Amino acid sequence: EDVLAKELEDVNKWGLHVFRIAELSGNRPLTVIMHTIFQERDLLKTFKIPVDTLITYLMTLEDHYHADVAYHNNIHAADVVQSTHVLLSTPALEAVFTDLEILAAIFASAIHDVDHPGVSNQFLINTNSELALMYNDSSVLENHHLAVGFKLLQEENCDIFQNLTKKQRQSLRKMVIDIVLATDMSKHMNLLADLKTMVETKKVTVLLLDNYSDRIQVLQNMVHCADLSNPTKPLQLYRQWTDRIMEEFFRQGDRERERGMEISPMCDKHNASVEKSQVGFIDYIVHPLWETWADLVHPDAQDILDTLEDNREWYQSTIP
Amino acid sequence: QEDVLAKELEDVNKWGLHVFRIAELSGNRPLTVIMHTIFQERDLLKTFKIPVDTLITYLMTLEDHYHADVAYHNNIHAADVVQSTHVLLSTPALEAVFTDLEILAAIFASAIHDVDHPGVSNQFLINTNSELALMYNDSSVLENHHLAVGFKLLQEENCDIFQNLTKKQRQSLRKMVIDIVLATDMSKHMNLLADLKTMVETKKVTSSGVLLLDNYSDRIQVLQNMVHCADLSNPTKPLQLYRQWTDRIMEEFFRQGDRERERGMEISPMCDKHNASVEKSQVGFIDYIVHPLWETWADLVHPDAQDILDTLEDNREWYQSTIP
Ligand SMILES: COc1cc2c(cc1OC)[C@H](Cc1c[nH]c3ccccc13)N(C=O)CC2
Ligand SMILES: COc1cc2c(cc1OC)[C@H](Cc1c[nH]c3ccccc13)N(C=O)CC2
Ligand SMILES: [Mg+2]
Ligand SMILES: [Mg+2]
Ligand SMILES: [Mg+2]
Ligand SMILES: [Zn+2]
Ligand SMILES: [Zn+2]
Numbered sequence: 001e002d003v004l005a006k007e008l009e010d011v012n013k014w015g016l017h018v019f020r021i022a023e024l025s026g027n028r029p030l031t032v033i034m035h036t037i038f039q040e041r042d043l044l045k046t047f048k049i050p051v052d053t054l055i056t057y058l059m060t061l062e063d064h065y066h067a068d069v070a071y072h073n074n075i076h077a078a079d080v081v082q083s084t085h086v087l088l089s090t091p092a093l094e095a096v097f098t099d100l101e102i103l104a105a106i107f108a109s110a111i112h113d114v115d116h117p118g119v120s121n122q123f124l125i126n127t128n129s130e131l132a133l134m135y136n137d138s139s140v141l142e143n144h145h146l147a148v149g150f151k152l153l154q155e156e157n158c159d160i161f162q163n164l165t166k167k168q169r170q171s172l173r174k175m176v177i178d179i180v181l182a183t184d185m186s187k188h189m190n191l192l193a194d195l196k197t198m199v200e201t202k203k204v205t206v207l208l209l210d211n212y213s214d215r216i217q218v219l220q221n222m223v224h225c226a227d228l229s230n231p232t233k234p235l236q237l238y239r240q241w242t243d244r245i246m247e248e249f250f251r252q253g254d255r256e257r258e259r260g261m262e263i264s265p266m267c268d269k270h271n272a273s274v275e276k277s278q279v280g281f282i283d284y285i286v287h288p289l290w291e292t293w294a295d296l297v298h299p300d301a302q303d304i305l306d307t308l309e310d311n312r313e314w315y316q317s318t319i320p
Numbered sequence: 321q322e323d324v325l326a327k328e329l330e331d332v333n334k335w336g337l338h339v340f341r342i343a344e345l346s347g348n349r350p351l352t353v354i355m356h357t358i359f360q361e362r363d364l365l366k367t368f369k370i371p372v373d374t375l376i377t378y379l380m381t382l383e384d385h386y387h388a389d390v391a392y393h394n395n396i397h398a399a400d401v402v403q404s405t406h407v408l409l410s411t412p413a414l415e416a417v418f419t420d421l422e423i424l425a426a427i428f429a430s431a432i433h434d435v436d437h438p439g440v441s442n443q444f445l446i447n448t449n450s451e452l453a454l455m456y457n458d459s460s461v462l463e464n465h466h467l468a469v470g471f472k473l474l475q476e477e478n479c480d481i482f483q484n485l486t487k488k489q490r491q492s493l494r495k496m497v498i499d500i501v502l503a504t505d506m507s508k509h510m511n512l513l514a515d516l517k518t519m520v521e522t523k524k525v526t527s528s529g530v531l532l533l534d535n536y537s538d539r540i541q542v543l544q545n546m547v548h549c550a551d552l553s554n555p556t557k558p559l560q561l562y563r564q565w566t567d568r569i570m571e572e573f574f575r576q577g578d579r580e581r582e583r584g585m586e587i588s589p590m591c592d593k594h595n596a597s598v599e600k601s602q603v604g605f606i607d608y609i610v611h612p613l614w615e616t617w618a619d620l621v622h623p624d625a626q627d628i629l630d631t632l633e634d635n636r637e638w639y640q641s642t643i644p
Contacts, residue, residue, distance in 0.1 A: 133468055135464070
């Protein structure tokens with residue numbers, strides 16, 4: 001409680017003790033961290049959001065993250081939110097984003113995985129799930145996360161946007177949808193190609209982004225970087241995230257094995273190589289993304305990129 | 321009554337089928353009887369081992385999920401798009417181009433393409449914060465819903481008309497049907513037309529004179545545009561059919577506009593019954609949407625569609641003549 005507030009002073013820092021915060025807050029890290037960031041950024045006054053409404057929505061949203069899902073739960077959501085919060089403060093992006101864009105990114109991060117069942121889009125498609133039937137096999141989870149996140153605003157005393165105009169609401173809604181849909185990993189390559197294009201064409205004084213298309217692309221990549229930030233965190237945090245994602249993957253592979261389905265990559269507990277998978281994850285996905293991001297905001301991401309490279313070196317050394 | 325119905329269904333291969341008569345003669349089952357006729361005409365029940373009782377049960381359930389109280393986006397419209405697609409599939413320039421599975425996908429897509437349509441636009445559903453727009457994140461709201469319903473109904477009792485397809489066949493058909501129905505969203509029309517024009521300008525024809533389509537992207541693009549053209553085919557039909565479609569779309573538009581007016585919203589284009597110009601709206605629809613599309617389709621299959629294009633141009637002249 002007093003240690004809880006002590007831990008929350010590192011809210012602007014990469015490496016926040018999120019698991020400690022989750023424990024101290026009574027499994028409410030999403031709520032407390034979101035509340036802290038909103039205060040820190042003066043968003044409640046800027047958007048005239050009533051404190052009780054905020055808390056009420058946050059707790060309801062946090063309740064819709066599954067507590068029996070090892071990785072895609074409220075701790076992950078809190079982590080992405082806080083990570084986004086830090087990336088938004090990158091010096092190279094000063095004066096780029098409007099206040100509504102900042103609120104959109106943070107809100108998008110909070111709801112980006114809500115009601116995740118702990119199985120992949122491909123699993124949902126292959127089991128002819130109700131979700132895949134509703135969403136026609138296209139960004140199935142991500143469409144559902146958005147629909148739940150927005151539907152919860154309609155609950156009693158949960159409309160945190162009640163004092164925004166209809167136009168501001170309509171603009172925020174579009175931005176949030178665009179950002180969350182971009183967290184679908186099947187979109188990673190296209191996103192990264194666009195981020196690369198922007199880096200080669202970049203104008204700076206600090207980054208100068210005149211049109212909406214470029215600005216949303218940056219926000220999309222930012223939240224995607226935040227979603228894929230575990231290997232860039234201090235190793236003690238990273239290893240906990242690896243344990244959780246492997247537990248979730250293995251539970252999926254157990255359901256697949258029981259059903260007689262082909263077991264998804266990295267999901268077979270009888271045949272896994274956790275460490276080799278992490279090095280390959282970093283080499284082919286996480287480092288290309290964060291290296292391109294670091295170029296965009298050169299040199300503000302340096303410490304983050306240094307940690308990622310230290311962690312890749314350590315995981316490689318655990319392979320005999 | 322059944323004799324006359326049968327007589328009328330002999331015209332199923334013809335542009336200008338008496339679809340409103342068939343709707344009455346069949347007891348408001350035009351979608352069921354026209355789909356059944358086309359499946360028999362194309363031997364699809366035999367090819368895909370579809371039990372006839374399963375086909376009829378699914379068709380009647382699908383048809384039930386069109387709204388009988390919506391003036392335009394109802395089972396008659398669905399039946400019309402199905403039949404129009406069936407005629408377009410038979411164009412000489414496409415002989416032996418598409419597989420039986422692709423033919424099945426295009427016809428099935430047409431049948432389900434507007435199922436459970438509430439008679440209001442995507443923009444109306446978004447602006448009124450509807451449950452549908454909340455479910456689908458404001459993106460192809462209606463068309464995603466039409467797909468979800470059309471596929472879900474296959475799971476009802478004795479409704480799985482695809483029960484004897486292989487797994488790979490079902491997977492391929494599902495993807496093609498989704499790609500086709502999503503392309504009926506009018507917000508995709510400009511890009512879709514732009515693409516079709518690019519294909520026309522670079523088209524390859526085989527030694528028999530038919531279209532050469534040797535990759536999924538080009539194949540699905542043709543089927544997408546084919547169904548879109550069928551969806552936008554009312555002004556290409558004989559005038560007595562076209563005028564009835566215009567009467568119906570304007571009733572539906574006016575009812576949406578009444579809802580908008582009551583709610584204080586800006587009335588959508590063509591939806592104000594106090595400030596409507598039905599004739600000018602048809603000429604604009606043809607000039608900026610329907611003729612650009614059909615002239616490009618006619619170019620793709622040249623000269624197969626020349627009579628259809630000639631009718632479109634005659635109907636544009638007629639509507640224009642009513643203005644002065
Ligand atoms: C801590 O480590 C991880 C964390 C996460 C993943 C993988 C990790 O480690 C291999 C995967 C990423 C992913 C999606 N498709 C893929 C295909 C190949 C490789 C990775 C992925 N995630 C979700 O499912 C995000 C979190
Ligand atoms: C018979 O006449 C019609 C039939 C149809 C439409 C318009 C017609 O006549 C103006 C509209 C086309 C349309 C969609 N958004 C638009 C925006 C502007 C103009 C047209 C459209 N449809 C559905 O909504 C399809 C059927
Ligand atoms: Mg996700
Ligand atoms: Mg009905
Ligand atoms: Mg439609
Ligand atoms: Zn996530
Ligand atoms: Zn239609």
